[PDB]
Design a protein around this ligand. Sequence first.
Ligand SMILES: Nc1ncnc2c1ncn2[C@@H]1O[C@H](C[C@@H](N)CC[C@H](N)C(=O)O)[C@@H](O)[C@H]1O
Ligand SMILES: CNCCCC[C@H](N)C(=O)O
Length: 423
Amino acid sequence: LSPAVQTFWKWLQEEGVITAKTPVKASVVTEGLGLVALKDISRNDVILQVPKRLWINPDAVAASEIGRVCSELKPWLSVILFLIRERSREDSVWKHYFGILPQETDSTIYWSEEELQELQGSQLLKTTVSVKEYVKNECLKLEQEIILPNKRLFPDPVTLDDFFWAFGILRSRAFSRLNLVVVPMADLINHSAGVTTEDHAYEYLFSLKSPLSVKAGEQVYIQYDLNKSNAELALDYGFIEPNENRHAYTLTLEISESDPFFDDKLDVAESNGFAQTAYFDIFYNRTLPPGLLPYLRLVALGGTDAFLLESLFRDTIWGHLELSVSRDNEELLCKAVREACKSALAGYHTTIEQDRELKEGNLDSRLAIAVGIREGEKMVLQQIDGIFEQKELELDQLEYYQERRLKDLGLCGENGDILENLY
Ligand SMILES: Nc1ncnc2c1ncn2[C@@H]1O[C@H](C[C@@H](N)CC[C@H](N)C(=O)O)[C@@H](O)[C@H]1O
Ligand SMILES: CNCCCC[C@H](N)C(=O)O
């Protein structure tokens, strides 16, 4: 199979990890390296169980030679260093493990500038840049505060490449729900859309249980996360899914401070669970998130309907926001959204037709990722615009505040005056 791999498999054996009740070996699969069943495996059938003696989480770093210096560092920053450090030590307990780790993944955090150009105008590009920058600073401050000082624990220099290396390793390998633990064995099982149960973590050791009945020769998979968008999967790991329901685009709304009614609006927003700035994730084919419309109406409020910000309504204001304020309010927010969508759609360099034709051929993993992501984002953008386009049509089918107030007027009651004269 592989010198470095075969050597890694020997290591797990000389540790009690892989005994005989381990129905799985490693192999070269389209998705890198994976676990292939040596014998049939049934649902929830235990596959592997590595002893905590072999983790690489905050607790393991706090108990190593650098456990003192990283005493007050954020959990991930601590593991980043630990990982870089052990990677150099020829006497490390993971000497064989590291000889297996991929230097890179297809995460956007490794893409070249040309590769990144394929994501031009995409929300994913923005998210990736932000994250790259952040990690950079946080990592450079580490060099000057923990690496350079203790030139005794860190003999060799430390480049950004090494930093992003460890960050990537952490974000595409560690297990969240249990907090940022890593397991040299379980670190090999890949993701499949076949899995829809999501729940394979258990435990001192790490107990991994196959959520599916794999036949001998086949690969053992798991579901990384059902709720992530394709943009999220693209950054965290280096892949995405064809499933159009994974496409999402998040909108960001806010109550500007330049708004003449800022103070009252912020009061209304916070009193109902929303901050000065709010993020609404919009997934394809899914209905608009609750709160998006009422928050949009609050943003668009305006002088005419400002009377709703009075103490008198502080208890029902949100209810009115959910039902609708007025035709001018509604019409304003619709144009705002629709223009934002058109404006955004115009930032991409390919049409959806071109993306779809490209997908009909063979594409390098990174290009395939950019094409699927940008196509998806365009679908969401166009769906959002269509939703509000209808809205602009049905602009008069909504019963606004005024009309709702006169519904119960009782114009046609009784001839009250007959009783008014009886006393
Ligand atoms: N469904 C998938 N399609 C493509 N790559 C995948 C998939 N699931 C996992 N991976 C890869 O596996 C890596 C993350 C780890 N969970 C697994 C290690 C990987 N099998 C290796 O050979 O190192 C990521 O870098 C992904 O590139
Ligand atoms: C070997 N990589 C593990 C993937 C972890 C996926 C997700 N964070 C979880 O906790 O299930």
